[PDB]
Amino acid sequence: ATPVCAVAATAAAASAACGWVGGGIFTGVTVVVXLKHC
Known part of the structure; x- marks a missing residue:
């Protein structure tokens, strides 16, 4: 795992954090709000 494991953890962590960002x-939030009230 060493370096490889660290890479997976990094990219894997973004899955959520990275997905939220960008x-x-x-x-x-924009989609939910609309459909939520739109």
């Missing part, structure tokens, strides 16, 4: 959070 405008992903706005998409869900």
